Ligand binder design. Structure first.
Ligand SMILES: *[C@@H]1O[C@H](CO[C@@H]2O[C@@H](C)[C@@H](O)[C@@H](O)[C@@H]2O)[C@@H](O)[C@H](O)[C@H]1NC(C)=O
Ligand SMILES: *[C@@H]1O[C@H](CO)[C@@H](O)[C@H](O)[C@H]1NC(C)=O
Lengths: 99, 274, 8
């Protein structure tokens, strides 16, 4: 079992510049379990990040959540960079406010 | 309605980097309430949900001790599996186990279960009868026999019917305010142009609880299930969940499609177009 | 309370 992770980046509430929200990075469907997840703000590692909701599905692939409080700006960008055996180089997914 | 107590246990060997990493994450329904990660400086059982504060110091001590014992047992298991499978001591391996029980709204046992997996594949599992085990390969058969001579099935069944069922009730009692609530879904639709006079219609459902929800697209009152793209319902880090489902349509024919959202918190299914 | 696991 060598399954590549699916990285999904989203916020809890619809973004409104200035008002607090939460940015989530859900890494799912991956195996083996060893993984490296990092949340970035303007290309910089976000400090106090929270890892939660660790679980697995019926096919045994792993699911883990990365989240942190954040207040969006019309210009700040956020991204989630993940490292896993199934990939040569780290994969980074960017937060799309307009999805 | 029905509720469940589940535990996700993972044990991973990391040759040349020390002891295997051990974890225990517990959930009551779609809510994580307990956790243990041997990778903490000082490994200890910690509460993940607010309501678990109603448990005294002795709870955390016993769970921590039990957890550490569990960690040792798996360290041994990883060692055993190498022999069962005749594998090298230099490679990394993963053991996974999901154990739980579910009760009806009346609090009585609906079903219990425990399934193991080695390196991503089925290993051994307790049958619904809770009396016997079923093995995926010859390796797990050795285990099956062992546990049979030790009466493991009988022991695990006592846990499922008693311990598991009784602790679940308590947890639901203590966190009633959180575990029995219902956050209603807030929905909206986004529009995205595509090459060749076709637009993408994405339907979003936000901040709902519990996790179970249904999103469908329609045209002429019929569901386009097979032509939709969607993500698995996901946690938003605040105890609520979200989900989106999309469909590609002809430019100028958007108003023809409607999004339908059914949830335990929606007396009547939501309906919206673009 | 999680179950008490024993070697396989
Ligand atoms: C939740 O239940 C409350 C009753 O208290 C419950 O029982 C005591 C002994 C403790 O276990 C406590 O943690 C439990 O909550 C009700 O008074 C309260 O209204 C309920 N909340 C709602 C409305 O869901
Ligand atoms: C285990 O694999 C080794 C080679 O890697 C082989 O010599 C040995 O026979 C295998 N174990 C058995 C007895 O099947």
């Amino acid at each position: 079992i060598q399954k590549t992770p699916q990285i999904q980046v989203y916020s809890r509430h619809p973004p409104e510049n200035g008002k607090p929200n939460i940015l989530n990075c859900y890494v799912t469907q991956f195996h083996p379990p060893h993984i490296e997840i990092q949340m970035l703000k303007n290309g910089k590692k976000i400090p106090k990040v929270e890892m939660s909701d660790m679980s697995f599905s019926k096919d045994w692939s792993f699911y883990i959540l990365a989240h942190t409080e954040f207040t969006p700006t019309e210009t700040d960008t956020y991204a989630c960079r993940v490292k896993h055996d199934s990939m040569a180089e780290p994969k980074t997914v960017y937060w799309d406010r307009d999805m | 309605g029905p509720h469940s107590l589940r535990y996700f246990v993972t044990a991973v060997s990391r040759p040349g980097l020390g002891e295997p990493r051990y974890m225990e994450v517990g959930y009551v329904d779609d809510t994580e309430f307990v956790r243990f990660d041997s990778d903490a400086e000082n490994p200890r059982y910690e509460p993940r949900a607010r309501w678990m504060e109603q448990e005294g110091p002795e709870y955390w001590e016993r769970e921590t001790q039990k957890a550490k014992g569990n960690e040792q047992s798996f360290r041994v298991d990883l060692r055993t599996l190498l022999g069962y499978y005749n594998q090298s001591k230099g490679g990394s391996h993963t053991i996974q186990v999901i154990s739980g029980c579910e009760v009806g709204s009346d609090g009585r046992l609906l079903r219990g279960y425990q399934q193991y997996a080695y390196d991503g594949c089925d290993y051994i599992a307790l049958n619904e009868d809770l009396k016997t085990w079923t093995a995926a390969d010859m390796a797990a058969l050795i285990t099956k026999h062992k546990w049979e001579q030790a009466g493991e099935a009988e022991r695990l069944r006592a846990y499922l019917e008693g311990t598991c069922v009784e602790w679940l009730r308590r947890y639901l009692k203590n966190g009633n305010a959180t575990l029995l609530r219902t956050d209603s879904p807030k929905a909206h639709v986004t529009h995205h142009s595509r090459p060749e006079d076709k637009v993408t219609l994405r339907c979003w459902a936000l901040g709902f609880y519990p996790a179970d929800i249904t999103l469908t697209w329609q045209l002429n009152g019929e569901e386009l299930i097979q032509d939709m793209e969607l993500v698995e319902t996901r946690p938003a880090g605040d105890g609520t969940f979200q989900k989106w489902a999309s469909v590609v349509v002809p430019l100028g024919k958007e108003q023809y499609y409607t999004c339908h959202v059914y949830h335990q918190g929606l007396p009547e299914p939501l309906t919206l177009r673009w | 309370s999680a179950p008490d696991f024993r070697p396989l």
